[PDB]
Amino acid sequence: DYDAAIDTYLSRTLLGEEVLRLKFTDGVKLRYGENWHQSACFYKDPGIEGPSLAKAVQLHGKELSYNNYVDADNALQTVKELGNASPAVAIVKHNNPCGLATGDTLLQALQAAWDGDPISAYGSIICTNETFDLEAATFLNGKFIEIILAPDFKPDALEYLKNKSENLRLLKLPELREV
């Protein structure tokens, strides 16, 4: 690190050619890639930043893969543009947030996005802006989702989904409603 700094600074000050070192430490192999012979491996960053996939817990659900991470992040970015305040949600398929909603009590918003896309949908990445509740949990029942992101969850809700479903990659992100 020390030396890297000594490089970046000097290359930007003394001379002009600037050098950007990257922040990709602690690795983890995933399933594979777009195809079975396309092995991808997530490399977390040591940076303490804030809302990021690095700091998310897979309560239950088979190991997330390439596409998973990708879309999940796109979703996160979508919900994070609206900056707290008004309740909001989102969804996404093949790197395409195809279902943003705001509204009041999530319920409506959530389903309104499901109306937005009632085709492809099945197997998207719901990205709510706060905790999920049974109201719409029963709406989600049958409507296959790949991953469900959320700042936090409610015990009964969490349990409910957990046992009922057998695929939802529940990946609520501890404290994402900040900078």
Add this chain to the structure above:
RNA sequence: ACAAGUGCGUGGAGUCACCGGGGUACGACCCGAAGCCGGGUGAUCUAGGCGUGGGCAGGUUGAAGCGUGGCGAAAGCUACG
């Protein structure tokens, strides 16, 4: 029960007493436990429930809430009271 043998019985001595021994049942030569069961007694102690009262020197710590002030484009972060 057919027979043959055999068992028991048969040519009159028992019965009623008094004084004794002994067996058996009853407390049974005397004393010696824990226990079992019937009907009554007890919550002045102690355990718990309830009603209605009494009490806890003097200090310490300093949650939420509230006021003012900082740092911030906001998001938000933060000091003291």
